[PDB]
């Protein structure tokens, strides 16, 4: 209901780091890899596609498909890399 707007999120070098080793960025979902997360899990922590997300929900719809656990907090938040 409320968080009407998008939020916003900062990348820490930790993440860009970790995902480093891998050769890839956090805002681009690791789900298609083809867009962004513009979404957030919570209280999890889980950040996707949600047009990625529909997908899923198209599937099957349990909750984050990251925690396979029901989400609470969920809204269209904007990624920013560090
Ligand atoms: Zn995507
Ligand atoms: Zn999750």
Sequence with gaps: GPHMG?????????????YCEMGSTFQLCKICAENDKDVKIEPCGHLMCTSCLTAWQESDGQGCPFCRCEIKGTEPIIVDPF
């Design 6 to 18: 998008s939020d916003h999120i900062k990348v820490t070098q930790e993440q860009y780091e970790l």
